Amino acid sequence: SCPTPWTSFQSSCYFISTGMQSWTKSQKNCSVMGADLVVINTREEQDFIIQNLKRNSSYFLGLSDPGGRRHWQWVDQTPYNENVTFWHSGEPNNLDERCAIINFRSEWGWNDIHCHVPQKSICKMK
Amino acid sequence: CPTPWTSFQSSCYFISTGMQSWTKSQKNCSVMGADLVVINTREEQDFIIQNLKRNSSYFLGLSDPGGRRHWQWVDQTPYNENVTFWHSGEPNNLDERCAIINFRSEWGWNDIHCHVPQKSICKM
Numbered sequence: 001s002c003p004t005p006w007t008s009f010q011s012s013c014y015f016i017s018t019g020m021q022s023w024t025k026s027q028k029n030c031s032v033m034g035a036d037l038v039v040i041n042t043r044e045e046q047d048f049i050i051q052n053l054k055r056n057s058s059y060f061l062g063l064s065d066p067g068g069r070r071h072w073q074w075v076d077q078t079p080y081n082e083n084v085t086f087w088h089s090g091e092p093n094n095l096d097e098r099c100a101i102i103n104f105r106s107e108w109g110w111n112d113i114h115c116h117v118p119q120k121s122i123c124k125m126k
Numbered sequence: 127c128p129t130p131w132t133s134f135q136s137s138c139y140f141i142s143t144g145m146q147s148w149t150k151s152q153k154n155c156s157v158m159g160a161d162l163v164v165i166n167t168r169e170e171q172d173f174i175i176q177n178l179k180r181n182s183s184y185f186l187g188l189s190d191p192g193g194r195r196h197w198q199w200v201d202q203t204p205y206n207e208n209v210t211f212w213h214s215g216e217p218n219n220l221d222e223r224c225a226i227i228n229f230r231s232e233w234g235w236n237d238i239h240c241h242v243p244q245k246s247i248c249k250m
Binding site for chain 1: 152161162164165166167168171187188189190191195196197198199200201203205209210211212213214216217218220223225227230233234235236237
C-alpha cells in the first residue's frame with residue numbers, strides 16, 4: 001500500500017521515473033516525493049525492480065562516485081599524509097564523478113556512466 | 127651505502143638516469159633490493175632535491191593503481207561488493223596515475239600517466 005503510481009515491495013515503495021534527467025536532477029526529483037534514487041540491497045529487490053522496468057530503457061540508480069581526491073598510495077604501504085606533500089601549483093588532477101545506471105543488454109545489469117547525461121530513474125522510499 | 131648511492135639518516139638513495147615507465151622504474155628499484163622513493167618528511171624531500179638536476183623530472187613511489195571506483199549509495203547504505211549486479215566487464219577500470227618530482231621555473235610534484243618515460247629515484 002503506497003501512493004497511487006508507486007509499487008510496493010516488502011518495506012519499500014518504488015517509483016519508475018519516466019522523464020530523462022541528469023543524476024543530480026533525478027535525485028532531486030525523488031527527494032521532493034520523500035524518496036531517494038533506488039538503493040538495491042538484495043537479489044530479490046533487484047528481481048522485483050526488473051519486473052517493473054521496460055527493456056527499451058535505461059535508469060539511474062542511487063549509486064555513484066563523487067570523484068575528487070585520488071587515492072594516492074606509497075608503493076611500500078606507507079600511509080599517505082596530505083600535509084607532507086609538495087604538489088606543484090594547481091596539482092594534482094581531480095578525479096571525475098561517475099554514476100551508475102541499470103539497463104537491458106545482450107541481460108539486466110549495471111553500468112557506469114557520466115553523471116550529467118539524461119537517463120530515466122528509480123526512486124525508493126521505505 | 128653502496129658507492130653509487132647517497133646516504134641520509136638510515137637510508138640510501140639512487141638517482142636513475144634511464145627514462146622508463148613507472149612499473150619498470152619500480153622493477154628496476156626492486157631488483158636492487160630497493161623501492162621507488164617514499165617521502166616521509168619535509169627534510170627527506172630537501173635531501174633528495176640536493177641530488178637532482180634542475181633539467182630533469184623523476185618518478186616517485188606515489189601512485190593511484192586504479193582498479194575499482196569508490197561507489198557509494200545515496201543514503202549512505204554500505205557498498206557491499208557481494209550484492210552488486212554490474213554487467214560483465216563493467217564498471218570501467220579506473221585509470222592509473224603516478225607522481226613525479228621536477229623543477230618549475232621551484233621543486234614540486236606533478237601527477238601524470240604512468241606509462242610515460244621519466245627518470246626515477248630509488249630508496250632502500
